[PDB]
Amino acid sequence: QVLEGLDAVRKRPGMYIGSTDGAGLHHLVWEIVDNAVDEALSGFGDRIDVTINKDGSLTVQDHGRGMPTGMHAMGIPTVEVIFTILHVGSSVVNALSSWLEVEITRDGAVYKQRFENGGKPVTTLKKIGTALKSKTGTKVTFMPDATIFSTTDFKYNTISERLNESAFLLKNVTLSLTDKRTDEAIEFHYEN
Query: Binding pattern to ligand 1YM, positions 130-169, x when CB under 6 A?
Result: --------x-x-----------------------------
Query: Distance (Å, rounded) from C-alpha 182 to C-alpha 36?
Result: 25
Where does this chain touch ligand 1YM (CB under 6 A) — which range of 1-9, 29-37, 141-149, 176-184? 29-37
Q: Are 121 and 115 in contact (CB under 8 A)?
A: yes
Query: Considering beta carbons, is residue 11 or 128 the nearer one to ligand 1YM?
Result: 128
Residue with the closest Cβ to ligand 1YM?
35
| Annotated binding-site residue? 88 | yes
Query: Considering beta carbons, is residue 9 or 82 the nearer one to ligand 1YM?
Result: 82
By the rule CB under 6 A, 68 interacts with ligand 1YM = yes
Phi, psi of 147 (to 5 degrees): -80, -10
Q: Are 44 and 64 in contact (CB under 8 A)?
A: yes
Where does this chain touch ligand 1YM (CB under 6 A) — which range of 20-28, 35-43, 69-77, 183-191? 35-43
**DSSP 3-state of 21:** coil
Query: Considering beta carbons, is residue 21 or 39 the nearer one to ligand 1YM?
Result: 39
DSSP letter assigned to residue 66: -
Helices (H), the chain: 7-11, 13-17, 22-41, 78-84, 89-95, 156-170
